[PDB]
Amino acid sequence: VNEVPDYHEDIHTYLREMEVKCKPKVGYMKKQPDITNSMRAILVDWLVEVGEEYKLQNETLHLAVNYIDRFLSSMSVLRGKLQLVGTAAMLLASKFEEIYPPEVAEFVYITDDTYTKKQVLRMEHLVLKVLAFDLAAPTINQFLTQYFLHQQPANCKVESLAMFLGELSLIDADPYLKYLPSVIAAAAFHLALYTVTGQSWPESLVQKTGYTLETLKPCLLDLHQTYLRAPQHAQQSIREKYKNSKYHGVSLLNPPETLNV
Amino acid sequence: SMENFQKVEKIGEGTYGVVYKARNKLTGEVVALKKITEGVPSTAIREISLLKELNHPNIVKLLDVIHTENKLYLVFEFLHQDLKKFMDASALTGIPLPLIKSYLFQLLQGLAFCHSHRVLHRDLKPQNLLINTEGAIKLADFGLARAFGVPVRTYTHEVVTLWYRAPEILLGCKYYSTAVDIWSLGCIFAEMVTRRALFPGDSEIDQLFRIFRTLGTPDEVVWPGVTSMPDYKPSFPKWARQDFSKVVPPLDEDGRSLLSQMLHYDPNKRISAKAALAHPFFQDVTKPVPHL
Ligand SMILES: COc1ccc2c(c1)/C(=C/c1cnc[nH]1)C(=O)N2
């Protein structure tokens, strides 16, 4: 019952439909006059640090990022206000997903008093208005945990490494805004499985998802390059986080040099 | 913003704030207005976000949200009465069997739709089930609900109004799932038939002992793993399981069979809402208007 046998295919279908509706605009950053891909990377890396400091769920982080990308798809923001958007997004995601969210004062503290309490609460309301309260969005993690049920047998390193790779994709809007969560999750699962065990995307997931290594190839080639370059990336908080024994130290594993795909 | 609504009277109150009956002056529609620091409450954020996609004939509809600087109004569909008040008003007449069966059939359709959309309700009790004069019954109050993942992760402990709370929650299990809302509906089926709560405890331990006195103290045969659960104690008294026909004497054989599957100890064996819709108890189900 913890794997909901009678509902898991209905839920998967439903998430498939909702990811298309919650999808940010692929080309938004070129329409932002004052912010760039690089400034977004810095913000998302900081949110990883905040989630680590307050011991928040990984789902909470993924939700906050969906909210930010949706908000910036329609609202032009100056570089001095980008962190105010991020803070309000993380506050909303914590209220939705956490048993014990941090208090608003804690969210003011982590911005170093760049912003007042009143500014954070005002931005909360604006983000709710712009998104029309539509907060129950699908994430990469929601698809990953379903895919993990197809392992024969379950491997903790495969699970943590796929999580790590999905997380790295959050940092880089080019190229990852062009792929759906269910696709990033599938490429991440295949790459982690291959790296740890030598195995490949299983037939049982072809039956569930309709995705094959053929349709996954473009995202897989991107993700592979990202994994190879991760030690040199300007942003490092995800690699540091996934050194921890909580995540079986998976950021210390060596990427495969080729995929044969 | 609210210029088009005329308040009529107060109809409810809770943790959230207060509910009024009101009437749209332009369309004539009757509505329920739920009126609502740390910014917007997390219970309101969950209610609004989760009801945006839960459009179903047996789930109360969220029609609009009016979010000012100062107040937040949720504009909901209005229904005449709650099932708790109807059960009181049916005192010595009883509620006819065709109406009980229709209401249970409808509650199971609403619940299966929630579960198919990854939502746990977590507070099903007669006060949160609303009825109208045409024979509909609908699930209401999603402020205690929560969107789940597959498989589930640990969520808020000690949930569900005590009298309707499942044993896996009382025993402190790390995980709970869709089976908790089924337990609640089993308690509600018994209550419609008798008119009194099935397990009316006054503390968590008294709640457990009342359930054990009716269904037997569970062991490793009936419920594998039970003796390792965090709040299980080997000193619990060991009560014998009672012939199910003594639990709700007026219920026939099919009714008894469905109730026993909704109140199974082991959450892995408890019946799903989806599976229950095909139970032989519902072979002759219709949808009559309520008798009062
Ligand atoms: C508590 O949340 C809700 C939500 C929607 C609602 C009611 C209550 C509600 C309450 C009620 C009580 N008796 C008649 N109606 C109603 O008609 N619609």
Author numbering:
A (entry chain B): 172 to 432
B (entry chain A): 0 to 35, 41 to 296
Task: Give the text the authors published on this PDB structure.
Members of the cyclin-dependent protein kinase (CDK) family have diverse cellular roles that include regulation of the cell cycle and transcription and, in certain cell types, differentiation (Lim and Kaldis, 2013, Malumbres, 2014, Morgan, 2007). CDKs share a conserved protein kinase domain that comprises a smaller N-terminal lobe linked through a hinge to a larger C-terminal fold (Endicott et al., 2012). All CDKs require binding to a cognate cyclin partner to remould the kinase fold from an inactive conformation to one capable of phospho-transfer. We have used biophysical measurements and X-ray crystallography to investigate the ATP-competitive inhibitor binding properties of cyclin-free and cyclin-bound CDK1 and CDK2.
AZD5438, Dinaciclib, and SU9516 bind with low-nanomolar affinity toward CDK2-cyclin A and show up to 16-fold selectivity for CDK2-cyclin A over CDK1-cyclin B. Our structural data show that cyclin-bound CDK1 and CDK2 form the two conserved hydrophobic spines. In addition, cyclin-bound CDK1 and CDK2 form a series of interactions between their respective N- and C-lobes through atoms that derive from (1) the extended hinge region of the C-lobe, (2) the base of the β sheet that comprises β1-5, (3) the C helix (which is part of the N-lobe), and (4) the activation loop (which forms part of the C-lobe). In total, these elements form 133 and 145 inter-lobe contacts (<4.0 Å) for CDK1-cyclin B and CDK2-cyclin A, respectively. This network of interactions correlates with enhanced stability of the kinase fold and could, in turn, enhance the binding of small-molecule inhibitors.
